[PDB]
Design an enzyme around this catalytic site. Structure first.
Site, short mmCIF file in Angstrom:
data_model
loop_
_atom_site.label_atom_id
_atom_site.label_comp_id
_atom_site.label_asym_id
_atom_site.label_seq_id
_atom_site.Cartn_x
_atom_site.Cartn_y
_atom_site.Cartn_z
CG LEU G 41 41.64 35.53 39.48
CD1 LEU G 41 40.84 35.10 38.28
CD2 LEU G 41 40.73 35.73 40.68
CG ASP G 42 44.26 30.16 44.77
OD1 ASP G 42 45.41 29.83 44.45
OD2 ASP G 42 43.66 29.68 45.75
CB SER G 43 46.36 27.46 41.44
OG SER G 43 46.28 27.08 42.80
#
Ligand SMILES: CCCCCCCCCCCCCCCCCC(=O)OC[C@H](COP(=O)([O-])OC[C@H](O)COP(=O)([O-])OC[C@H](COC(=O)CCCCCCCCCCCCCCCCC)OC(=O)CCCCCCCCCCCCCCCCC)OC(=O)CCCCCCCCCCCCCCCCC
Ligand SMILES: CCCCCCCCCCCCCCCCCC(=O)OC[C@H](COP(=O)([O-])OCC[N+](C)(C)C)OC(=O)CCCCCCCCCCCCCCCCC
Ligand SMILES: CCCCCCCCCCCCCCCCCC(=O)OC[C@H](COP(=O)([O-])OCC[N+](C)(C)C)OC(=O)CCCCCCCCCCCCCCCCC
Ligand SMILES: CCCCCCCCCCCCCCCCCC(=O)OC[C@H](COP(=O)([O-])OCC[N+](C)(C)C)OC(=O)CCCCCCCCCCCCCCCCC
Ligand SMILES: CCCCCCCCCCCCCCCCCC(=O)OC[C@H](COP(=O)(O)OCCN)OC(=O)CCCCCCCCCCCCCCCCC
Ligand SMILES: CCCCCCCCCCCCCCCCCC(=O)OC[C@H](COP(=O)(O)OCCN)OC(=O)CCCCCCCCCCCCCCCCC
Lengths: 558, 177, 459, 171, 100, 128, 87
Positions: G41-43
C-alpha cells in the site's frame, strides 16, 4: 389564610432540608439523589396547594416574617411576595427540576461526585426560588447572585477542563456587567424613592423612571443573554447536560425576563423603556436564531434556541404585554427542558457524541427520544394546540396588532421562521437519514428514570399550555380582532421556515461541493462577536493591567 | 515545526498531514457518508495526480498552493473528536486523574481497607527504587557529550533491567477513573 | 477598658512562664478567653457611646474593631506556630510577646478618648509589627521600601503630630467627647488647607491610598503569616478609624478637599483590581485586593454620609476577616510548595477538596456575595456614592466586575485545572489549617445573620 | 397583638362560598385536614406553654425619658447641658426614624391589601407619607455623618431665614 | 570556596512520625490537647455562646424601644389631630434670628 | 486568485501559510537541530529530577523563578527617566484622574446649582 | 454504557475494517502484515487506514503516531496504550 402562607414557607424549608442533610453527614448515603428527588417531588406537591387556592380566589399575600435590618428609614425584612408570578413559577420550576433530577440519576450515574452535583443543583433551586419570591431588591439580589454563582459552579463542574473554567468565568463576567445595572436600579430606588420594597416602588410610581429601567434592562441583558451580553449562554453548554437543561434553558436564564416582568407598572408608564426592550429583544431573537442555523453541536443549537426565545420574551415585554411573556416562560420551561434532556439522551447513548454531523438513523433506534424530540420541536415552533402555541402565537397576535416598531416586528417574524428552520435541522441531522455515528452501537434508553423523566415533561409539553392558560385570570385584554392575513401570520411564517429548511436539507444529498459564502462564515463564527471581543477587550485590559498600572506607575513613578 | 523526535516536518509528512486535514475538513463540509466518500475518492485522485513529482522545489510550491487551497476551502467549525483537543469531552476527566503518590498520604485505617493493593504497591515501589540507579547509570554512558540530541529514550538493554524514565509512564492514571 | 488591657498584659507572664511544649496552647486558650470577654463591649446605646473613664471609651465604631482585634490574636497564634517549630524557644516567646504587645497597643488605640494618646498608640503599633516583619519574614530585600518609610514619616505622622498639638493649643483639648461639642467650622484658608492635609495624609497612607499603596504589596510579601494577618485585618483599619474621628474637626473644608483623593480612590480601585488580574504572586494579589477594597472605605469616609459610614465600617470588619483568611489560604499552600508563585501549584481541588471549599467560600466573600457583610458594606458605600454623584456607579460597577474577575481567577488558577506533576509534597489538610479557615469564615458568615453590630455609631 | 390606631386595618369584607359546579374542590378537604392535623396539636402545645407563662407572671417596662433642656437654651461650649440636649436630640432622631418606618409600613400594607385599586384607595396613606417625608427631610436631611443638634439647629435657622425672606419678598 | 555553612534543612512531614497529627505539634499528646483547646475554646465557647450572647443582646442601640416609643407618639398625635412630624425640630418661638 | 490571509496582533498567521516554514537550507537544519538539542537536554534535566524517587518536593524551574523575578524585582533598577517614560507616565498617570475629576466636578456643580435653585426632585430623598 | 475493549475485540475490529478494504485481500491479511512492504500500500493508503481506525473507534490518533503505525498489531497495541485494556 393559614394554609397558604404555611405551605408557602414549608416548600422553601423543605427544599433547604437536604442541604442540612448533606452537611450533617457521617455515613455513605442510601441514595441521596433519590432523597433530593423525593424531596423536590414533595415540595412540588406542597406548592400545588397555594397555587390552587390562588386560582380559586386570586389570593395574593406578603410574608414579611423576619425583621433583619433597619438602616434609618429602610426596614429590610425577610419578605416573600406570593403573587401570580410566584404561584405560576414555583410549581413549574419544581416540576421541571424533579424531571431533571430523575434524568440526572441516569445521566450523571458515572460521576463519583454525584452527591455534590445534586447538592449544587438543589442550591441553585433554593437561590432561584429566593429570586422569584423576593419582595425587596436586596433579597432578589441575594437570589440573583446565588443563581450566578451556582451557574459558575455548575458550568465548571469538570474543573480540570480549561474550557469549562473559561466558560464559567465568562458567564460570571457577563452577569456582573448586568449586575452593574441591577445595582444602578437599587441605587436609584433607594435615593429617589427611599425603598427597595416593591410595594413602595409601585405605590409611589415615579415618572422620571428612565434611568432605573435602563439599569433593569442592562440587568436583564446580563442575565437573559440579550445582545451585547449574550455569548456566555452558548459558552455555558460546556457544563453537563442536566445543568444546561435546568439552569441555562428554562430556570436561570428567564430571571432577567422575570426581573422585567416583575417591574411591569414602571414599564407600562414608560414608552422609552418599552421601545428599548422591543429593539434589544428583536435584535437578540434575530441574531441568535440566525447563528443557530449553521451550527453542528446540538447543545449549542438548543442554547441559541432558548436565547432566541428569551429575545422573544423581551419583545413581548416591549409591547407592554408582560403576562404573555410570563406565560411564555412557564410554557417554554417544559419543552425546552425536554429538548435538552432528549439531546443529552442521544449524547449519552452515542458515547459523548454531541456533533450532529455524526448522528442520524435514530428514528427507530431511540423511538421514545425521537417522539419527545419531535414533540418538543413542534411545541417550540408553534404547532397548533401544543403548549408553545398558547403563548408564542398570542405574542405574534399582539406583536402585529399594536403600536409597534415595524422593523422589530419584521425581525420577530424572521426569528419565528428561523425557529422552524433549526428545529427541522435538528430533526434532519439527528433523527432522519442514515447513520453517521461510529460502528460499536451501544444505543439504549430503557431505564425507567430516563423514560419517566422525559414522560412527565412530555405530559407537560402536551397539556400544560392548555391547563395553565385556562387556569390563569385575565390581566390585559386579549386583542382578538385582526384580518385573516394577520391572524394567519405566525403559522404561515413557521410553515415557510419548514419548507425553506427542507429545501436546504434536500440540497445536501446532492453531489456538489460549494465554496463557503460570507453569510455562512458570518453565522458559523457567531456574527464574529465572540471571536473579536473575547480577544480584544481582555488584551486592552491586561496589557493596561501590566504595562502602565503595575510596572510604570505603581512600581516606579508613584 | 515543533515535534519531539524530529526538529522539522519532512515533505512526505507534510503531504500526508495536508491530505489528512483536507479529508477531515472535507468530511466536515460534506456531512453525508456516500457523498463524502464520492468526494473523498475525487480528492484522492486530485492528490494522486501529482504523487509522482520528482522536483522537490516544484512539489514545495504545489504543496504551498495546496495549503492555500485547503485554507480557502476549510470549514469554520470542523468536526473535532470529543476527546480530541478542541472537543466537547476533551480533558474532561482530568479532575479525576489523581496522581499515584497521593496513596502514600493515606491514613493507615484506610490503607488497611485494601490490604492486597498496598501490599503489592510496596513491591511496585521496591521495583522502582532498585531500578532507578541502574537506569541512571544506563543513561549517563549512552548520552553523548552536550546532552541528548533528541528527546527519545533508549530501551532496557540488559535482561532484568527496566527501561529508563518509566515510572510516570507506567503508573499514569487511567483515562476513565 | 481595663478589664481587657490587664488580661492582655497577663498574657506576657503567661507566655514567659509556660512550659516549652505548652506555650502555644496556653496563649491560644487565654487569648480565646479574652476574645470571649470582648463581647461585653456590645453595651452600646442609640444616643450615648460607652464611656469608661477619662482615658478610654467605646462607641459602635471602635467596638467591632476591638472584637476583631481580640479575636485576631488566637488565629495568628494558630497560623504562625507551624513555621516556628524549628525556632529557638526564647525567640518563639519573643514572637508571641510582640504579637501580644501589638494587641495591647491596638486595643487601647481604638479606645483612645484623647487624640494624642491615639497618636502615641497609633505610632506605637508600628514597632512590634516592624520587628515581626523583619525578624521572621524569611527573606528581607527592602532597598526601595526604606525610602518609602521615610516618605511615610515625612508626609504622614509628623504633620499629624504638629496638627494635633495645634488643636491642643487652639481648642484647649483633644478629647473627642469635648470636640463633639466644641468643634468650630474649619473655613476656607491656606492655613486650613495644610491643616487638612496634616490631619489626613497619615491615615491616607495607612489605608492605603492609590499611588501611596507602594508599601503594601511589599510589606505583605516580606512578612510572616501573623504579620500579614494583622496588616490586612487591623492595621489598615487604623487609618479609617482615625479618619472617622478626625473628620469631625475638618468640616466644612472636607466638602472641597475630598475631591482630589476621591478621584485617587475611584480610579484607583479600577487600577489595583485590574492589577490583580496580572499578578504572578498570590500574596501580592491579595495585597492589591486589599488596596482595591480600602479605596471604597476612603471614598465613604470622605463623602461623610450616614450610609457611607455604615458601609465603610461594615466593609472594614468584613474585609479584615476575608483578607486575613485569604492570606492564611496563601500560606496553607506556601507551607507545602515553598514558593508564592500562583501558577506553580494548580488543580488543588483534585488533592484537597475541603481546602478548596474554603477557597471557594473566601472567594465568594471576596467578590461580595450577598447577604455577606462584604456585600452589605460594598452595597451601602455604592448607594451613598450614588447619592454623591450618579455617574460614579459606573466606576463602582466596573470595579464590581473586576473584583469578581480576579476573585474566581485566584480560585480557578490555584484550585482548578490540571494538577502540577512535579509537586508531590502536597500533604492532606492539617486540622489546624482547617480550624484556622473555619475560625475566619464562620464568624464572617454568622455576622450576616445580625449585621447591626458592625454598622458603626450611626446605625 | 398591637394597637389598631397606629397600624390601621380597614374592616375585612370576605365573600361567602358560592359553589356553582358539582365537582368538590380540594381546598375544603385540605382545610379540614389542616385544621385537624396541624392547627389542633400546635394549639394544644401553645396552651401548655401559655399555662407555663401564667405560672410565672412578671413584667417589663417601656423606658421614659423626661424632657431635658434642648440645644437652643444651652449656653455655648457648656458640655454638661448641651450633652443632655444632644442625647435628647439623638433619641428624638431615632424615634422620628421609626415614625417614618411606621408610615412606610402603612403605605406598603395599603398597596398590597388594596391590590389593583391601590392608586384609588390609598390616597390618604400616600398623603401622610408625603407629609412625613417632607417633615423628616426638612428636619434631618443633609446634616452629614457627624450630625449633631448644632447642625440641625443651624439648618433650621437657615430654613427660617429663607422662609422669612420669602415672606418679605411677597409683600 | 565560600564559608562554612550548615545545609538547608529539609521540610519535615508531620504525618510520617504521627499519622494522626492534627498539625499543631509534633508531640502527639501535645498535638491532640492543642486540638481540644482550639476546638473547645474556639467553637464550643466563643462561637456558640458568643452567638447566643449577641442574639440576646438587650436591645442593641435601643432600636426596639424607638419603634415602641414611635408607636406611642403617632398614637398621641393621630388622635389629637396633630401632624405626624413637624418640619422644625425645635420650637420656632424660642429662636432669635439675625435681623436685616 | 485566492483571498490572502491577513495576520493580526490577535490573529496570527498559520504555520502552513508562512513561507519561512518551507525553508530547506542547511542553516535552518542547524538552527532546528540546536533548538531540538536544547529542548532535549532541558527535557532530560527535568525528568531525571521528576522520575527520581529520592526527591519528594518541587522540581524548581529557574525559568519560572526568573520570570517571577522579572515581573516583580527588575522593574525599578532598569528604569531610565526619558521622554518616553515621562510622557507615558503622564498620559496614563495623571490623565484619567483629571478626566474623572472634571466630569464629577461638573456633575456635582450642576446638581448643587439645581438644588439651591429648587429644581432637583429631592422629594422622597431622605436616605443619603 | 461504555463497553470494555479487549485485545481480542480490538484485534477483530481492526482486522474487520481491513477486510472491508478493496486494496487488501482478505486471504493474505495477517496480524503482522506490513502496509507498504507486505500488503503493498501507499502512504496515502496508510493515512486512509489510520483515518478509518479513527472512524472505527471514535477517537483521534495524532499524526506523529499515524506516520509510524505500519501493521495491524501496532494499531492494536496503540489502542491498547490509549484505552488501558486488560485491567
Ligand atoms: C446562630 C445559629 C445559626 C444557625 C444556622 C447557620 C448559619 C450559617 C452558619 C455557617 C454556614 C456554612 C457552614 C458550612 C460551610 C463551612 C464548612 C464547609 O465547607 O463544610 C462543608 C461540609 C460539607 O461538605 P463535604 O462534602 O462533607 O466536604 C467538603 C467537600 O469536600 C468540598 O465542599 P463542596 O464544594 O462539596 O461544598 C461546599 C459548598 C459550596 O457551595 C457554595 O459555594 C454555594 C454557596 C453560594 C450560593 C448559595 C447561597 C446563596 C445565598 C442564599 C442563602 C442565604 C440566605 C437564605 C435566607 C433566605 C433568603 C434571603 O458549601 C456549602 O454547601 C455550604 C452551605 C452554606 C453556604 C452559605 C453561603 C456561603 C457563600 C458565601 C457567603 C454568601 C453570603 C453569606 C451567607 C450567610 C448565611 C447565613 O459541611 C460540613 O461538614 C458542615 C460542618 C458544620 C457546619 C456548622 C455550621 C454552623 C457554624 C456556626 C457555629 C456557631 C452557631 C451554632 C450553629 C450550629 C449549627 C449546626
Ligand atoms: C428543625 C429546625 C427547627 C427548630 C425545631 C425546634 C423548635 C421548634 C419550633 C418553634 C421555634 C420557636 C418559636 C418560633 C421562633 C421564634 C419567633 C420569634 O419571634 O423570633 C424572634 C425573631 C423575629 O424577628 P423580630 O421581628 O421579632 O425581631 C428582629 C430583631 N430586631 C428587632 C432587633 C431587629 O427572630 C426569628 O424569628 C429568627 C428566625 C428567622 C428565620 C429566617 C432566618 C434567615 C437568616 C438569613 C440570614 C441573612 C438574611 C438576609 C435577607 C434579609 C431580608 C432581605
Ligand atoms: C502633609 C503636608 C502638609 C504638612 C504641613 C506641616 C504640618 C502642619 C500642621 C498644621 C499646622 C497649622 O496649624 O497650620 C496653620 C498654620 C497657620 O499659622 P498660625 O495658626 O500660627 O496663625 C494664626 C492663625 N491665622 C492663620 C488665622 C493667622 O500654618 C503655618 O503656620 C504653616 C503651615 C504649613 C507648614 C509649612 C512647613 C511644612 C511643609 C510641608 C512638609 C511636609
Ligand atoms: C463583630 C466584630 C468582630 C468580627 C469578628 C468576630 C469574631 C468572633 C466571633 C464571636 C462570636 C460571633 C459573633 C457574631 C454572632 C452573629 C450571629 C448571631 O448572633 O446571630 C443573631 C441572630 C439574631 O436574630 P434576630 O435579629 O432575629 O434576633 C431576635 C432577637 N431575639 C433572639 C432576642 C428575639 O440569631 C439568629 O438569627 C438565630 C435564628 C435561628 C437560627 C437560624 C435559622 C435559619 C438559618 C438558615 C437556614 C437555611 C437557609 C438556607 C440556606 C441555603 C444554603 C446556603
Ligand atoms: C400545521 C399544519 C401542517 C399541514 C399544512 C401545511 C402543508 C404544507 O404546505 O406543507 C408543506 C411541505 C410539504 O410539501 P413538500 O415537502 O414541498 O412536498 C413533499 C410532500 N411530502 O412540508 C411539510 O408538510 C412539512 C412541514 C410541516 C410543518 C408542521 C408544523 C407547523
Ligand atoms: C504624589 C503622591 C500620590 C498622590 C497623593 C496626593 C499628593 C497631592 C496632595 C494634594 C492634592 C492637590 C491639592 C488639593 C487640591 C484642593 C483644591 C485646590 O487647592 O485647588 C487648587 C487651587 C484653586 O484655588 P483655591 O482652592 O481657590 O485657593 C484658595 C484657597 N482658600 O489652585 C491654586 O491655588 C493654584 C496652585 C497653588 C499651589 C498649591 C500647593 C498646595 C497643594 C499641594 C500640596
Amino acid at each position: 389564610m393559614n394554609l397558604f402562607s404555611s405551605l408557602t414557607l414549608v416548600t422553601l424549608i423543605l427544599l433547604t432540608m437536604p442541604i442540612a442533610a448533606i452537611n450533617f453527614n457521617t455515613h455513605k448515603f442510601t441514595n441521596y439523589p433519590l432523597y433530593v428527588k423525593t424531596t423536590i417531588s414533595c415540595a412540588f406537591i406542597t406548592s400545588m396547594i397555594p397555587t390552587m387556592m390562588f386560582i380559586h380566589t386570586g389570593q395574593e399575600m406578603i410574608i414579611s416574617n423576619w425583621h433583619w435590618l433597619t438602616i434609618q428609614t429602610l426596614k429590610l425584612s425577610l419578605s416573600f411576595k406570593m403573587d401570580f408570578f410566584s404561584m405560576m413559577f414555583v410549581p413549574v420550576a419544581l416540576f421541571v427540576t424533579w424531571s431533571i433530577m430523575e434524568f440526572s440519576m441516569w445521566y450523571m450515574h458515572s460521576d463519583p461526585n454525584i452527591n455534590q452535583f445534586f447538592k449544587y443543583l438543589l442550591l441553585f433551586l433554593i437561590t432561584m426560588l429566593i429570586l422569584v419570591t423576593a419582595n425587596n431588591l436586596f433579597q432578589l439580589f441575594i437570589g440573583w447572585e446565588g443563581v450566578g454563582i451556582m451557574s459558575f459552579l455548575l458550568i465548571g463542574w469538570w474543573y480540570g477542563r480549561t474550557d469549562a473554567n473559561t466558560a464559567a468565568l465568562q458567564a460570571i463576567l457577563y452577569n456582573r456587567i448586568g449586575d452593574i445595572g441591577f445595582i444602578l436600579a437599587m441605587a436609584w430606588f433607594l435615593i429617589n424613592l427611599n425603598t427597595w420594597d416593591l410595594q413602595q416602588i409601585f405605590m409611589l410610581n415615579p415618572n422620571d423612571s428612565n434611568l432605573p429601567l435602563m439599569g433593569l434592562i442592562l440587568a436583564a441583558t446580563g442575565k437573559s443573554a440579550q445582545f451585547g451580553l449574550h455569548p456566555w449562554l452558548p459558552s455555558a453548554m460546556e457544563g453537563p447536560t442536566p445543568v444546561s437543561a435546568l439552569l441555562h434553558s428554562s430556570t436561570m436564564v428567564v430571571a432577567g425576563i422575570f426581573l422585567l416582568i416583575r417591574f411591569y407598572p414602571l414599564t407600562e408608564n414608560n414608552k422609552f423603556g418599552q421601545s428599548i426592550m422591543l429593539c434589544l429583544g428583536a435584535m437578540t431573537t434575530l441574531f441568535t436564531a440566525m447563528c443557530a442555523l449553521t451550527q453542528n453541536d446540538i447543545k449549542k443549537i438548543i442554547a441559541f434556541s432558548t436565547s432566541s426565545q428569551l429575545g422573544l420574551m423581551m419583545v413581548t415585554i416591549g409591547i407592554n404585554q408582560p403576562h404573555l411573556a410570563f406565560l411564555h416562560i412557564c410554557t417554554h420551561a417544559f419543552f425546552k427542558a425536554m429538548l435538552f434532556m432528549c439531546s443529552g439522551s442521544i449524547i449519552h447513548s452515542l458515547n459523548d457524541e454531541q456533533d450532529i454531523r455524526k448522528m442520524g438513523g435514530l428514528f427507530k433506534a431511540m423511538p421514545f427520544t425521537t417522539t419527545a424530540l419531535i414533540i418538543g420541536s413542534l411545541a417550540l415552533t408553534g404547532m397548533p394546540f401544543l403548549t408553545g402555541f398558547y403563548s408564542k402565537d398570542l405574542i405574534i397576535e399582539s406583536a402585529n396588532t399594536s403600536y409597534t416598531n415595524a422593523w422589530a416586528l419584521l425581525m420577530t417574524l424572521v426569528a419565528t421562521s428561523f425557529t422552524a428552520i433549526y428545529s427541522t435541522r435538528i430533526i434532519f441531522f439527528a433523527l432522519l437519514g442514515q447513520p453517521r455515528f461510529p460502528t460499536l452501537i451501544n444505543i439504549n434508553e430503557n431505564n425507567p428514570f430516563l423514560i419517566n423523566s422525559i414522560k412527565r415533561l412530555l405530559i407537560g409539553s402536551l397539556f400544560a399550555g392548555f391547563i395553565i392558560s385556562n387556569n390563569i385570570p385575565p390581566m390585559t385584554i386579549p386583542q382578538m380582532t385582526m384580518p385573516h392575513y394577520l391572524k394567519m401570520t405566525a403559522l404561515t411564517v413557521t410553515i415557510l421556515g419548514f419548507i425553506l429548511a427542507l429545501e436546504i436539507s434536500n440540497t445536501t444529498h446532492y453531489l456538489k461541493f460549494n465554496y463557503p459564502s460570507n453569510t455562512f462564515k458570518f453565522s458559523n463564527l457567531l456574527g464574529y462577536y465572540p471571536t473579536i471581543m473575547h480577544r480584544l477587550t481582555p488584551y486592552m485590559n491586561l496589557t493596561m493591567s501590566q504595562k502602565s498600572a503595575s510596572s510604570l506607575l505603581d512600581l516606579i513613578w508613584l | 515545526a515543533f515535534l519531539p523526535s524530529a526538529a522539522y516536518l519532512t515533505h512526505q509528512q507534510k503531504v500526508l498531514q495536508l491530505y489528512k486535514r483536507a479529508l477531515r475538513h472535507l468530511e466536515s463540509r460534506c456531512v453525508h457518508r456516500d457523498k463524502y466518500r464520492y468526494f473523498a475518492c475525487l480528492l484522492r485522485a486530485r492528490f494522486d495526480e501529482h504523487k509522482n513529482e520528482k522536483d522537490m522545489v516544484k512539489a514545495t510550491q504545489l504543496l504551498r498552493e495546496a495549503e492555500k487551497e485547503f485554507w480557502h476551502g476549510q470549514h469554520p467549525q470542523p468536526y473535532i473528536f470529543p476527546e480530541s483537543p478542541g472537543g466537547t469531552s476533551y480533558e474532561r476527566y482530568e479532575c479525576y486523574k489523581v496522581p499515584e503518590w497521593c496513596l502514600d498520604d493515606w491514613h493507615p485505617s484506610e490503607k488497611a481497607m485494601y490490604p492486597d493493593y498496598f501490599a503489592k504497591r510496596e513491591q511496585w515501589k521496591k521495583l522502582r527504587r532498585e531500578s532507578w540507579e541502574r537506569e541512571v547509570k544506563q543513561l549517563q554512558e549512552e548520552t553523548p557529550v552536550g546532552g541528548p540530541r533528541t528527546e527519545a529514550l533508549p530501551p532496557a538493554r540488559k535482561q532484568g533491567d527496566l527501561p529508563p524514565l518509566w515510572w510516570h509512564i507506567v503508573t499514569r492514571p487511567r483515562e476513565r477513573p | 477598658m481595663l478589664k481587657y488591657i490587664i488580661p492582655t498584659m497577663m498574657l506576657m507572664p503567661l507566655t514567659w512562664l509556660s512550659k516549652n511544649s505548652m506555650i502555644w496552647i496556653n496563649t491560644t486558650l487565654h487569648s480565646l478567653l479574652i476574645s470571649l470577654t470582648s463581647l461585653l463591649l456590645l453595651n452600646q446605646f442609640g444616643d450615648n457611646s460607652l464611656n469608661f473613664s477619662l482615658t478610654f471609651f467605646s462607641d459602635s465604631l471602635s467596638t467591632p474593631l476591638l472584637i476583631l482585634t481580640m479575636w485576631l490574636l488566637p488565629l495568628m497564634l494558630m497560623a504562625s506556630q507551624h513555621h516556628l517549630s524549628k525556632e529557638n524557644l526564647a525567640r518563639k516567646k519573643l514572637f508571641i510577646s510582640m504579637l501580644i504587645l501589638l494587641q495591647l497597643f491596638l486595643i487601647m488605640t481604638f479606645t483612645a478618648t484623647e487624640l494624642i494618646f491615639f497618636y502615641i498608640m497609633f505610632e506605637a503599633t508600628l514597632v512590634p509589627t516592624l520587628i515581626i516583619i523583619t525578624r521572621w519574614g524569611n527573606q528581607t530585600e527592602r532597598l526601595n521600601a526604606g525610602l518609602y518609610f521615610l516618605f511615610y514619616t515625612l508626609a504622614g505622622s509628623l504633620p499629624l503630630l504638629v496638627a494635633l498639638i495645634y488643636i491642643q493649643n487652639t481648642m484647649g483639648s483633644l478629647n473627642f467627647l469635648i470636640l463633639q461639642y466644641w468643634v468650630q467650622p474649619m473655613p476656607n484658608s491656606w492655613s486650613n488647607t495644610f491643616m487638612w492635609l496634616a490631619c489626613m495624609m497619615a491615615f491616607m497612607v495607612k489605608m492605603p491610598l492609590y499611588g501611596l499603596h507602594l508599601w503594601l504589596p511589599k510589606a505583605h510579601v516580606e512578612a510572616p503569616i501573623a504579620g500579614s494577618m494583622v496588616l490586612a485585618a487591623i492595621l489598615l483599619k487604623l487609618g479609617g478609624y482615625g479618619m472617622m474621628r478626625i473628620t469631625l474637626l475638618l468640616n466644612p473644608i472636607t466638602d472641597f478637599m475630598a475631591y482630589p483623593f476621591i478621584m485617587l480612590s475611584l480610579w484607583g480601585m479600577i487600577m489595583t483590581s485590574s492589577i490583580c488580574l496580572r499578578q504572578t504572586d498570590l500574596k501580592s494579589l491579595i495585597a492589591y485586593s486589599s488596596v482595591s477594597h480600602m479605596a471604597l472605605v476612603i471614598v465613604a469616609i470622605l463623602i461623610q454620609t450616614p450610609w457611607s459610614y455604615m458601609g465603610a465600617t461594615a466593609l472594614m470588619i468584613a474585609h479584615g476577616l476575608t483578607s486575613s483568611m485569604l492570606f492564611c489560604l496563601a500560606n496553607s499552600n506556601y507551607e507545602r510548595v515553598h514558593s508564592r508563585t500562583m501558577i506553580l501549584a494548580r488543580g488543588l481541588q483534585t488533592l484537597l477538596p475541603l481546602m478548596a471549599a474554603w477557597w471557594l467560600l473566601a472567594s465568594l466573600t471576596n467578590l461580595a456575595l450577598p447577604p455577606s457583610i462584604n456585600l452589605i458594606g460594598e452595597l451601602f458605600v455604592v448607594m451613598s456614592t450614588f447619592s454623591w454623584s450618579n455617574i460614579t456607579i459606573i466606576l463602582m460597577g466596573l470595579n464590581m466586575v473586576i473584583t469578581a474577575l480576579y476573585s474566581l481567577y485566584m480560585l480557578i488558577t490555584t484550585q482548578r485545572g490540571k494538577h502540577t506533576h512535579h509537586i508531590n509534597n502536597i500533604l492532606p489538610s492539617f486540622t489546624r489549617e482547617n480550624a484556622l479557615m473555619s475560625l475566619h469564615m464562620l464568624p464572617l458568615l454568622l455576622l450576616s445573620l445580625n449585621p447591626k453590630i458592625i454598622l458603626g455609631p450611626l446605625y | 397583638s398591637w394597637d389598631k390606631d397606629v397600624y390601621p386595618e380597614p374592616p375585612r369584607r370576605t365573600p361567602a362560598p358560592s359553589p356553582q359546579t358539582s365537582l368538590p374542590n380540594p381546598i375544603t378537604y385540605l382545610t379540614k385536614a389542616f385544621d385537624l392535623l396541624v392547627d389542633r396539636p400546635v394549639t394544644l402545645v401553645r396552651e401548655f406553654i401559655e399555662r407555663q407563662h401564667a405560672k410565672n407572671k412578671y413584667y417589663y417596662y417601656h423606658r421614659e425619658f423626661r424632657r431635658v433642656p434642648d440645644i437652643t437654651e444651652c449656653h455655648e461650649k457648656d458640655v454638661l447641658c448641651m450633652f443632655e440636649a444632644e442625647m435628647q436630640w439623638k433619641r428624638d432622631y431615632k424615634v422620628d426614624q421609626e415614625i417614618v418606618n411606621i408610615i412606610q409600613e402603612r403605605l406598603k400594607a395599603c398597596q398590597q391589601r388594596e391590590g389593583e385599586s391601590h392608586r384609588q384607595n390609598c390616597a390618604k396613606e400616600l398623603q401622610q407619607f408625603t407629609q412625613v417625608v417632607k417633615a423628616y427631610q426638612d428636619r434631618y436631611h443633609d446634616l452629614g455623618a457627624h450630625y449633631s443638634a448644632r447642625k440641625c439647629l443651624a439648618k433650621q435657622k437657615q430654613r427660617m431665614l429663607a422662609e422669612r425672606k420669602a415672606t418679605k419678598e411677597a409683600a | 570556596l565560600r564559608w562554612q555553612e550548615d545545609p538547608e534543612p529539609e521540610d519535615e512531614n508531620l504525618y510520617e512520625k504521627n499519622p494522626d497529627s492534627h498539625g499543631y505539634d509534633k508531640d502527639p499528646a501535645v498535638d491532640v490537647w492543642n486540638m481540644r483547646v482550639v476546638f473547645f475554646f474556639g467553637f464550643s465557647i466563643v462561637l456558640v455562646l458568643g452567638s447566643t450572647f449577641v442574639a440576646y443582646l438587650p436591645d442593641y442601640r435601643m432600636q426596639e424601644w424607638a419603634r415602641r416609643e414611635a408607636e406611642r407618639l403617632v398614637k398621641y398625635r393621630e388622635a389629637h389631630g396633630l401632624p405626624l412630624m413637624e418640619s422644625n425640630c425645635f420650637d420656632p418661638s424660642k429662636i432669635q434670628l439675625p435681623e436685616d | 486568485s485566492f483571498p490572502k490571509y491577513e495576520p493580526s496582533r490577535l490573529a496570527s498567521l498559520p504555520t502552513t501559510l508562512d513561507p519561512a516554514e518551507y525553508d530547506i537550507s542547511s542553516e535552518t537544519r542547524k538552527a532546528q537541530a540546536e533548538r531540538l538539542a536544547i529542548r532535549s537536554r532541558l527535557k532530560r534535566e527535568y525528568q531525571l529530577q521528576y522520575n527520581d524517587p529520592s526527591r519528594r518536593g518541587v522540581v524548581e524551574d529557574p525559568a519560572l523563578i526568573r520570570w517571577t523575578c522579572a515581573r516583580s524585582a527588575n522593574v525599578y533598577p532598569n528604569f531610565r527617566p526619558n521622554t518616553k517614560t515621562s510622557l507615558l507616565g503622564a498620559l496614563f498617570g495623571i490623565g484619567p484622574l483629571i478626566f474623572w475629576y472634571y466630569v464629577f466636578k461638573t456633575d456635582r456643580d450642576r446638581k448643587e446649582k439645581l438644588i439651591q435653585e429648587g429644581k432637583l426632585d429631592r422629594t422622597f430623598n431622605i436616605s443619603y | 454504557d461504555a463497553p470494555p475493549l479487549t485485545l481480542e475485540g480490538i484485534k477483530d475490529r481492526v482486522l474487520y475494517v481491513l477486510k472491508l478494504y478493496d486494496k487488501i485481500d482478505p486471504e493474505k491479511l495477517s496480524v503482522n502484515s506490513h502496509f507498504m512492504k507486505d500488503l503493498g500500500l501507499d502512504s496515502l493508503d496508510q493515512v486512509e487506514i489510520i483515518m478509518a481506525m479513527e472512524d472505527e473507534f471514535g477517537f483521534e490518533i495524532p499524526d506523529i503516531d499515524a506516520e509510524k503505525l505500519m501493521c495491524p498489531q501496532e494499531i492494536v497495541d496503540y489502542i491498547a496504550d490509549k484505552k488501558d485494556v486488560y485491567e
